Swiss-Prot record, chain A:
Homodimer. Glutathione binds at residues 6-7, 40-44, 53-54, 66-67. CDD domains: GST_C_Mu (cd03209), GST_N_Mu (cd03075). Pfam families: GST_C_3, GST_N. The keyword Nucleus does not apply. This is Glutathione S-transferase class-mu 26 kDa isozyme. Its EC number is 2.5.1.18. Residues 84-202 form the GST C-terminal domain. Substrate binds at residue 110. InterPro entries: Glutathione-S-Trfase_C-like, Glutathione-S-Trfase_C_sf, Glutathione_S-Trfase, Glutathione_S-Trfase_N, GST_C, GST_superfamily, Thioredoxin-like_sf. PANTHER family: GLUTATHIONE S-TRANSFERASE (PTHR11571), GLUTATHIONE TRANSFERASE (PTHR11571:SF222). It comes from Schistosoma japonicum (Blood fluke). Residues 1-82 form the GST N-terminal domain. Belongs to the GST superfamily. Mu family.
Length: 216, 217
């Protein structure tokens, strides 16, 4: 069965875990704890990876790194990437727009001067969320009636910005409805209640925002 | 014809430009100059873009933003993304590894403490480049005998890191050769010599690094 290797955090891989649980696919996790940086560095160059990094995904057919290449491969193997160039570009554009939010947090989350950079991010965040509000005006999910990988990426981004500002969705009822819809998927519900779910941290443990061993 | 809208810099879109020139595909550029922030603010919500942003690519019915969605769409229309899930994953992985170098530069280039952040980046860069040197063992391009979009992304990343550290490819002669090989593609050489080529800046004009109006002579 496939092996998914990452830090014991949400970070870059949480959307991939959510997709694997939505598809109900068997996989093994190799999790690196806060004190297992040495364990990772001594294995890193001996797994056959062409671009050694975390996370990594190893099945029969593939040895992958790059979080976007991994989530796209799992989608692609399930016929979820889109049927024609236009639909595939729509899905890649949604991907990018979600990363503008999720990388927007990560960019500033490890900085000494985080409190200053937060003011600016929370000023631009409304506009980014409005575009998703409009996309989800009459669509159950970002691509219509059927779930795609950017749904889990957006879920993860909403999870993270709600910690930084618990009122950030008060203006965005369609995003609140979308978020509850994801959570009501029976196999997502079971995952979120399971011993396998990693609630914290959001970033690397060293992060000034969404770090430490426990929520603040 | 397709419209490619961006700032008059290299930045996010330069690999897209190179790919269009490789394909010899006709396109028009809407180029926003340093003084045209107002021009853009005014047109931004008027173009029919679902996720308004720079760069944008407008192809009659197809209206796209996100640089990676744009370069992938152009590749996809020419059947260049990969024939099966495994080949499509190899191209996606190459794409991500190039972006770790290119975004690695962009994420510190707008910082006040660039000189401090540069030391940390240049202690990691030799190993990141080594992974590309190793991939080019017995290969003309990153995916073998045929050009793919990550080749133009790597070419762009190599141009940018050579400005930050002129010696960073001294240990990597297969990367020096790769960069010369791209520049010997005849439709690339023609573009690089033309009046359409934007040599500078690398980042937004306001950047601590790769910014301003001319390179250092």
């Amino acid at each position: 069965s496939p092996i998914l290797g990452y830090w014991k955090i949400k970070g870059l891989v949480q959307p991939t875990r959510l997709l694997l649980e939505y598809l109900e696919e068997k996989y093994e996790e190799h999790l690196y704890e806060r004190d297992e940086g040495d364990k990772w560095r001594n294995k890193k160059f001996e797994l056959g990876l062409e671009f050694p990094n975390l996370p990594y995904y190893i099945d029969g057919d593939v040895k992958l790194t790059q979080s976007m290449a991994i989530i796209r491969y799992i989608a692609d193997k399930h016929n979820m990437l889109g049927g024609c160039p236009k639909e595939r570009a729509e899905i890649s554009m949604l991907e990018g727009a979600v990363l503008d939010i999720r990388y927007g947090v990560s960019r500033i989350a490890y900085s000494k001067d985080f409190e200053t950079l937060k003011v600016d991010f929370l000023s631009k965040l409304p506009e980014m969320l409005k575009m998703f509000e409009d996309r989800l005006c009459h669509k159950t999910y970002l691509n219509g009636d059927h779930v795609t990988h950017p749904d889990f990426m957006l879920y993860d981004a909403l999870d993270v910005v709600l910690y930084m500002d618990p009122m950030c969705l008060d203006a965005f009822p369609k995003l609140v409805c979308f978020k509850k819809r994801i959570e009501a998927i029976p196999q997502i519900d079971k995952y979120l209640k399971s011993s396998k779910y990693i609630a914290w941290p959001l970033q690397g443990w060293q992060a000034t925002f969404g770090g430490g061993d426990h929520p603040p």
